[PDB]
RNA sequence: CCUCUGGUGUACCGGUUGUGACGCCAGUCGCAUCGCCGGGUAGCUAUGUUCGGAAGGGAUAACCGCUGAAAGCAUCUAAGC
């Protein structure tokens, strides 16, 4: 359980507060909530935080390694955050940002309006690169994964949404 | 469902054959598959008319995922979603 021995250091502005089950962690960034499962328990001495198994458990220990892994996560968003920028790929595909609607013109017959969830940011360099920003690393995953589901590349001609630290397959006709 | 197009419609109207009767003519009636033939009001009815199988919401199958440790990596999963 190397991750969970390996403990997380707070870097100076944001601030965890346990309550209950029930953690929250406070940034600059924004607000962040966590729940604690039974077995782990965790600790605060100075800016360094522990997180060790209740019992001697190999479930308590895979549990509190995710947790360590968790608190990291969320430490590292508060503080500075994550940004995924996405590609298009294609002739004739464009993609534009307006309020917190993105729109896509991605060959279908009807352009696709996505409606960005709440506590992510995107922006335009060009119109064939979008970079999405936000805070919480699940949650701009998830936003990433939905806007590549309505056209993930094609490997003849790699045509599509791809992101750019992904490597296509290549096929060639007969 | 019967406004329209039709069918039927033996208590509606008419044309006509044989015979009997109403004293006779004229005019009527009975019987002959409703005697036979031509139409046909309401009702019932299809081949006639109108309408319907919508669109939505929740959970979910195969499948596709996010984040994530066991197992420093990786991983749709054991937590969570």
Do not use: C
Not at 2 to 25: H, I, L, S
Not at 133 to 144: D, E, F, R, T
């Amino acid at each position: 359980s190397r991750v969970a021995k390996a403990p997380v250091t707070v870097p100076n502005g944001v601030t965890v507060t346990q309550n209950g089950r029930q953690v929250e962690v406070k940034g600059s960034k924004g607000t962040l909530s966590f729940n604690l499962h039974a077995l782990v328990e965790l600790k605060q001495e100075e800016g360094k935080l522990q997180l060790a198994p209740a019992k001697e458990s190999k479930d308590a220990w895979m549990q509190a390694g995710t947790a360590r892994a968790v608190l990291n996560n969320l430490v590292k968003g508060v503080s500075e955050g994550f940004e995924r920028k996405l590609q298009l790929v294609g002739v004739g595909y464009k993609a534009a940002v307006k309020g917190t609607v993105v729109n896509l013109n991605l060959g279908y017959s009807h352009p696709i309006d996505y409606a960005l969830p709440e506590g992510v940011t995107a922006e335009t360099p060009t119109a064939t690169e979008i970079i999405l920003k936000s805070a919480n690393k699940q949650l701009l995953g998830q936003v990433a994964a939905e806007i590549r589901a309505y056209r993930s590349p094609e490997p003849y001609k790699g045509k599509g949404v791809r992101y750019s630290d992904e490597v296509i397959l290549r096929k060639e006709a007969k």
